Amino acid sequence: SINQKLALVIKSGKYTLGYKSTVKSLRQGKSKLIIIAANTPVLRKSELEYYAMLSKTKVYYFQGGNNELGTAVGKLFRVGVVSILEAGDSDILTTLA
Amino acid sequence: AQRVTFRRRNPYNTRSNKIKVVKTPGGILRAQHVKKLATRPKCGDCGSALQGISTLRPRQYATVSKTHKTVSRAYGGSRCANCVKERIIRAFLIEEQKIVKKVVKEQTEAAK
Amino acid sequence: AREITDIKQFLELTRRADVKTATVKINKKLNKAGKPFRQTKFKVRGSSSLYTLVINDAGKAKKLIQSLPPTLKVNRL
Amino acid sequence: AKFLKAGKVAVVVRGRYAGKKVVIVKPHDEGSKSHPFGHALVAGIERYPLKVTKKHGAKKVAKRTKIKPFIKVVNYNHLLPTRYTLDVEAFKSVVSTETFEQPSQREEAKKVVKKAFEERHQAGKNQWFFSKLRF
Amino acid sequence: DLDLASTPYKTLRYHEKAVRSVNFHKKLPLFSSAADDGTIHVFHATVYDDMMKNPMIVPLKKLTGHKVINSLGVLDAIWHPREAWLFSAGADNTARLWTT
RNA sequence: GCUUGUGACGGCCCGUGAAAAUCCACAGGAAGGAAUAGUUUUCAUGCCAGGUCGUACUGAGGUCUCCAAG
RNA sequence: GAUGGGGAAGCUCCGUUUCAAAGGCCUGAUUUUAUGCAGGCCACCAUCGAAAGGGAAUCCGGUUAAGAUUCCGGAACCUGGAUAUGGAUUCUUCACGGUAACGUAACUGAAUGUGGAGACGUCGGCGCGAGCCCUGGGAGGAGUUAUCUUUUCUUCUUAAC
């Protein structure tokens, strides 16, 4: 499960949350894998997809809303986009997800 | 404790017929007819009071300079800077989706 | 009615030749909380609006009335 | 990969030149004492070179190909980075931190920049950069 | 003139580059103007106090010789307190003193 | 406190809230612009003009309406 | 409610954009068998209907036997039109600063396309402002008082722009 794969990284490795910080990370090239929620705005979705195309970053669409991405990271609030700066003890990069 | 009359001919309490009781230099109270208040100009794309534009009567915009009716950007005196930002982003990516669609179209034609 | 806190500006207005009369208004006022003084007010009917000149000093007033064109009709108070 | 580079085309999003295309001559990834944020040094062109047909001759042609440039320190947050690229080597030593904040070093920056862009527009190349961003 | 108007009494636009520093002399009726073209222009300026008479400003000499270092001329100019000497400062890593 | 004006909110609706004259603004890129006053005046100052008709007073089971002391 | 149409023996009724040729603007070396006008742009519809709806701009003091936002004195503003000067338009040809929201004495912008104001239901509490009311000190006047009362009453104002 993806929830097991993510919650490990959020308790072990370096990460970020939200739009502005992910874009800052893509500019720095320090992002390795970005996670995009389903219910995110189309303009912000296209802007992240294009920025990742520039930085050459692997892109993963999270199946389900931002609430379920907040649940996945284990936080009460909602998150539109999550990045992976540092991959944890899991092999999340080399996997399909 | 002076009581105050309407000054213009309309005896009614309409939108146009508002009253401010003002103390005059003759030491007496008298009514002043309140000019109908100016509104903020608004974002045509957003629906929000756009910053840096003077708030005047419609006819009153004719007297004032262009630097009180326009901010310096493109779509300056008509949009938000957020709604301008959003359409710069949008027009860029739509224009680039056109390129990608031409790349796919040219590839499929070569396949056939 | 418009304030000009500007000395030679008033003197430029007086020599316009479209100006018939001037007026020098004298007032009794006090500073801060301590002492009474004498304020002058140099007013010309300009081309469109009346321009006024508050000079809190008495010596600058003494110089300015003297410095006016002698052909111009000057009004006290 | 740090895509925001010395030969990189960008679209300005904010402030007087919103919609106008630029090229980052020299990035500043972690700011300075003036500008304490990840910014970029750009030199884009304001008045775009207008269209020229076979009917236009000798004087109108000279009027249309005339370009008016601009130089500004701009934040990454107000930049839209583009996939495209542009040659920059002619004016790398012309625009720096010392170039900005103290004119008329900006004036002689603007003259070299004006030259470079007009000399590149003539002998028709990099045509996408000199076309108007329609929005 | 702070007595005449809110506009400039006399606009003069002669310099080739950005007018970097303009300074009065303290005693003598003189003022300089050091622009970014490596050129200081010196002016005589009479001021008439009591009489309602507008101040006369005349030019005197174009001081040159300063070296231009990457589109940068005279960064500052300051008068000597009591006589008509002037201290310049260019981009040529060199200050200069001017004399009558 | 009473009268009135205004600002940000929160309810009440699938009830989504007159029209036009008039005024302003943006996109657009046609055209124009120099060597005895180049082009442009949404900048400042200066000049002239603004017709007809109503206009008095009253207006208190019995037409409408405004101001409102202790 | 005319016009176009259609009824009606008719007085006149139906109908309001309808199968109306409903008109108002631009381009040009003068239009090549020689001085006869060519090409293009736009596609809804007269008008009346509000002295409480929308609407450019005026206040204060004064003045009569009876007129006042109208008259007088003072001080204003709006609209339209010619034009005159200073300033700008930079080394000559439509200005620049600010990361940015935006700022500015200006800083040309045709056809055509669009946006805002005009321009909008009703209530509730809360904030802020103006007027009225209550009040302390003080600068004047009128009153009552044998008694008590620094008492009661009144004046102390500030318009458009």
What DSSP line would sit under A16-80, residue for residue?
Answer: EESHHHHHHHHHHT---EEEE-SSS-HHHHHHHHHHHHHHT-EEEE-SS-HHHHHHHHT-SS--S
- Pairwise CA distance, residues D80 & A51, whole Å: 9
Q: Write the DSSP string, E57-74.
A: EEEEEEE--PPPSSS--E
- Cα E98 off chain centre by: 13
For CA atoms B18, B21, B22, B24, the dihedral sign is positive
List, in sequence order, every beta strand (DSSP E) within E18-85: 19-24, 30-35, 40-46, 56-63, 74-79
| Tally of domains in chain A | 1
Q: Of the candidates C9, C63, C67, which has its C-beta nearest E5's C-beta? A: C9
Burial of D44 (0-12, 13-18, 19+ CB in 10 A): buried
Say yes or no: Cβ of B107 under 7 A from any atom of strand F: no
Return the number of other C-beta atoms located less than 10 Å from residue D11's C-beta.
Answer: 23
Cα dist from C66 to A49, A58, B89, D64, whole Å = 80, 87, 69, 63
Residue numbers of E between 10 and 49 with CB closer than 8 Å to C: none
Which residue in chain E has the smallest CA separation from D109?
E71
- Pairwise CA distance, residues E26 & E79, whole Å: 8
- State the residue range of the domain holding A79: 1-97
Q: Is the Cβ–Cβ distance between C4 and C52 less than 8 Å?
A: yes
| Contact call for A43 and B90, based on CB within 8 A | yes
Q: Of the candidates E4, E50, E51, which has its C-beta nearest C9's C-beta? A: E4
Q: Does D75 touch chain B (CB under 8 A)?
A: no
Q: Which residues, in sequence order, are CB contacts of C28 under 8 Å at separation 6+?
A: C36, C38, C39
Helices (H), chain B: 82-111
Q: Does E52 touch chain C (CB under 8 A)?
A: yes
Tokens of E26: 């303290």
Q: Any idea what the CATH number is for the domain that residue A15 is in?
A: 3.30.1330.30
Tokens of D11: 């679209």
Q: What are phi and psi of A58, to 5 degrees?
A: -65, 140
DSSP B68: G
Say yes or no: Cβ of B59 under 7 A from any atom of strand F: yes
Q: How far is the CA of B56 from the C1' of F67 (A)?
A: 30
Q: Is the peptide bond before E88 cis (omega within 30 degrees of 0)?
A: no
Q: Which residues, in sequence order, are CB contacts of C46 under 8 Å at separation 6+?
A: C2, C13, C19
Q: How far is the CA of A58 from the C1' of G13 (A)?
A: 81
Within 8 A of A24 by CB-CB distance, chain D residues are: 38
Return the number of other C-beta atoms located less than 10 Å from residue B25's C-beta.
Answer: 5
- Pairwise CA distance, residues D13 & D28, whole Å: 18
- Pairwise CA distance, residues E89 & D43, whole Å: 31
Tokens of C66: 């003297």
| Contact call for E50 and C11, based on CB within 8 A | no
| Contact call for D83 and B95, based on CB within 8 A | no
- Cα D54 off chain centre by: 28
CA torsion, ordered E26, E28, E29, E33, to nearest 10 deg = -60
- Pairwise CA distance, residues B110 & B100, whole Å: 16
The rounded radius of gyration (Å) of the Cα atoms in chain D is 15
| Contact call for E50 and C63, based on CB within 8 A | yes
- Pairwise CA distance, residues D60 & D53, whole Å: 10
Q: Is the Cβ–Cβ distance between E40 and E33 less than 8 Å?
A: yes
Tokens of D98: 């010392």
Q: Which amino acid is at C49?
A: S
SS3 C54: strand
Q: Which amino acid is at A55?
A: S
| Contact call for E72 and D103, based on CB within 8 A | no
- Pairwise CA distance, residues E32 & E59, whole Å: 10
Say yes or no: Cβ of B34 under 7 A from any atom of strand F: yes
Per-residue burial over E25-49, b if 16 or more Cβ lie within 10 Å, else e, is: beeeebbbbbbbbbbbbbbeeeeee
- Pairwise CA distance, residues B69 & B78, whole Å: 9
Q: Look up the protein residue whose alpha carbon has the minimum distance to the C1' of G94.
A: D47
CA torsion, ordered E1, E2, E3, E6, to nearest 10 deg = 90
Which residue in chain D has the smallest CA separation from B81?
D14
Q: What are phi and psi of E4, to 5 degrees?
A: -85, -55
Say yes or no: Cβ of B112 under 7 A from any atom of strand F: no
Q: Is the Cβ–Cβ distance between A87 and A33 less than 8 Å?
A: yes
Place of tokens 């970029």: D40
List, in sequence order, every beta strand (DSSP E) within D3-130: 8-12, 21-28, 39-47, 68-75, 79-85
Distance from CA of B91 to the nearest CA of D (A): 6
Q: Is the Cβ–Cβ distance between A35 and A96 less than 8 Å?
A: no
Q: Which amino acid is at A71?
A: T
Q: Which amino acid is at A30?
A: K
Return the number of other C-beta atoms located less than 10 Å from residue A90's C-beta.
Answer: 16
Stated in angstroms to one decimal place, the resolution of this structure is 3.3
Place of tokens 């007013």: C43
- Pairwise CA distance, residues E6 & D71, whole Å: 33
Phi-psi region of D45 (alpha: psi -120 to 50; beta: other; left: phi over 0): beta
DSSP C14: H
Q: Does C62 touch chain E (CB under 8 A)?
A: no
Q: Which residues, in sequence order, are CB contacts of E24 under 8 Å at separation 6+?
A: E30, E31, E79
Please name which of A23, A30, A19, A22 lies closest in space to residue A80, comparing C-alpha atoms: A19
For CA atoms C63, C69, C71, C72, the dihedral sign is negative
Q: Is the Cβ–Cβ distance between A9 and A84 less than 8 Å?
A: yes
Question: To which H or E segment does residue A12 belong?
Answer: helix A2-12
Per-residue burial over A55-75, b if 16 or more Cβ lie within 10 Å, else e, is: bebeebebeeebebbbbbbee
Q: Which residues, in sequence order, are CB contacts of A65 under 8 Å at separation 6+?
A: A37, A38, A39, A78
Tokens of C1: 């009615």
Distance from CA of B101 to the nearest CA of A (A): 15
Residue of E2, E52, E53, E54 best to disrupt the C interface, most CBs of C under 10 A: E52
Q: Of the candidates B73, B87, B88, which has its C-beta nearest D16's C-beta? A: B73
